[PDB]
Amino acid sequence: SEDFVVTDRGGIVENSHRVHAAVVDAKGRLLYALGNPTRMTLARSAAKPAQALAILETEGVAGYGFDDADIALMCASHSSEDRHIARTRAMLSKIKAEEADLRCGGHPSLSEMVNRSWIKQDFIPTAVCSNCSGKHVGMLAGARAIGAGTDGYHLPDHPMQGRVKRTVAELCDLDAGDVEWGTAGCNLPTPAFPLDRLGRIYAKLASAADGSDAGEGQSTRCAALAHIFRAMARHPEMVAGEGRYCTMLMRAFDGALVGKLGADASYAIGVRASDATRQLGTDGALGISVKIEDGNLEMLYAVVTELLERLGIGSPDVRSQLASFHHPQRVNTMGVTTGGVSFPFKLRG
Amino acid sequence: SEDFVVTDRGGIVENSHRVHAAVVDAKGRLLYALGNPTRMTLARSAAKPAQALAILETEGVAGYGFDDADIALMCASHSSEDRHIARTRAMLSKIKAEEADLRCGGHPSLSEMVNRSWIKQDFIPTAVCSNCSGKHVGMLAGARAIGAGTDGYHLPDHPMQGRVKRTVAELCDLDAGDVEWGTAGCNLPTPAFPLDRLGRIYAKLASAADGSDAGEGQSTRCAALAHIFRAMARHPEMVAGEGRYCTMLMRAFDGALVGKLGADASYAIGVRASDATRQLGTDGALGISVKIEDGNLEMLYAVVTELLERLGIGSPDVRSQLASFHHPQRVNTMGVTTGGVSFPFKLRG
Ligand SMILES: [Cl-]
Ligand SMILES: [Cl-]
Ligand SMILES: [Zn+2]
Ligand SMILES: [Zn+2]
């Protein structure tokens, strides 16, 4: 397949970007694809709901009283807005830990507007400012809850990371050896697996949400997955922030799906069963995963929004809240439009 | 044909980027290649030496007394450092123009350190700060020199832009219809032509420098090309700025070559004849042009530096000054090395 997103200047090709995507049902069966839907792919932050599941399944973590917004922050790549930093500090208090216990580092904010404020202030970001700070507090919580020590909670030999590694493989329905591990920007183990299994994780999230809402008896795992979905959809501003794709996406859809960014341009969406999912040929929930081969985020958001339109997910009115991402502005320094974005890719069934 | 630069996280593929490259002799004969060496490509700022030639060949421009550093700024994508703004203003004064005559617009600086200083002072960049401001003053100069009027100097129907279009096609050895035109970020016509012809332009620059140095009877155009080469090599800080690839590259090579960035990740180099170029099998100067298909600038500089090493251009000590670009750091927020860059491409003859 030769599936691309392409930018032009006056009709002349500027850049082209290879697209990979998987659309799967709740059991992970492949329904539609772009590119190579089984591309071995670092999920990066798109794995965070699976890491939050490992946190929430750690015995004793329930006693700390994390609320839904705290869980959404565990699932976040937040913009380090003051509310994200404050909630991180409030979560540290719940587990009687301190910022010095964190093993993630500060970085320039993922939001340009926040980062400009920091620059004006000469603000130096610290550990609680990390976009991953919520995940790290949850990992510290789990380490405290099982009692072997918080030192080294971020290292592969720690039981919290053994729990994460098993949980990821289980949600993917993969043997341990089919998940590879590197080290994240936030200094935790981070997984790679075929792209379609990232879709599978998010189909399982949305499916658990459907079962919870229907009143079905659920395993402890499915109940926790439903809780994670509900937390992300109820507090999408915790998952990213003002003006961010994931937040704007989840607000527009008002509970019908959850979406999550991975660094270097992966994206995952879990869609609750609907007229649209039935029209796509499945009787339950759906999962979507996307990777832009070269890592370009602006192209990722254009492609994800185009894919939602092609799949019929939402309505023109709902998806129109994402118009600035769908068709990125190509306006020069004098206000003249110089080109645009095109989608020469073809979904295959 | 399948030529990539690949980044990894712990040996796991993160992103990959398709590379196109042409290495040509002084007549444009293809000597080595990556990818598609004739890819139709927007040269963007890498066309600036051709545009400077059109300016310098305009009747009467010699009377303004532009010096080598002014010509270097005509060829620049500068960082908007105070010295670039000051030289822009001095060039405007040479032609008795003012900032309001410029038809380029301000933008965030190409240098992070300049841009952070601006953010701290709440500085809003204006036309005089454009990375293309030196080209624009040169175009105003040519318009005024032939009595065409400054108004509209940037529009395709203006005789200055007629001269630019002719000069570009002639340097490429192309018919007019083989060069396509869009509108630049700086609001001028900007050309697209086969990537190898960008290398041809720069081989002609270095060839002319060789012929000037050898005291050959040069055409006036060759003499002006030699002047442009000399100006860029003598004043590389004008062409980009502190810490910028083009500046560090040209300083390391100390007159042996010139190099120039194009936006969306094109690069061009003109190499004077040397033991290295003779070892590559040509008896004259050579040109190099590169495009990263997806537009990533970090990967461009890594690839260009790797190509100089494969081609044997420079000494190991000279190219070690570019080590930070050749293998970009992949260290996380806690100081842990998480990945690297690889060059599985192979130069073909
Ligand atoms: Cl990293
Ligand atoms: Cl533009
Ligand atoms: Zn992280
Ligand atoms: Zn320009």
Author numbering:
A (entry chain B), B (entry chain A): 4 to 352
Quote the study on this structure.
Asparaginases (EC 3.5.1.1), which split L-asparagine to L-aspartate and ammonia, are grouped into three unrelated structural classes: Class 1 (bacterial-type), Class 2 (plant-type), and Class 3 (Rhizobium etli-type).
The zinc cation is only partially present at the metal binding site, with a refined occupancy of 0.5, as is the w1 water molecule from the metal coordination sphere. Moreover, substitution of Asp187 with alanine affected the metal environment, since a sulfate ion occurs right next to the strongly bound water molecule from the zinc coordination sphere. The sulfate ion fills a central position in the active site cleft, possibly preventing the enzyme from accepting a substrate molecule. The negatively charged SO4 2- anion forms a salt bridge with the protonated and positively charged side chain of Arg47. Surprisingly, the side chain of Cys249 is not oxidized to sulfenic acid, which may be related to a change in the zinc environment. Although Ser48 remained hydrated in the D187A mutant, the mutation completely abolished the enzymatic activity, despite the fact that this mutein can still bind zinc (KD of 7.2 μM). This observation may be correlated with the presence of the sulfate ion in the active site, which would hinder the acceptance of a genuine substrate molecule. We hypothesize that with altered metal binding properties, the coordination site of the D187A mutant could become specific for other transition metal ions, which could be bound during protein bacterial expression or purification on Ni2+ resin.
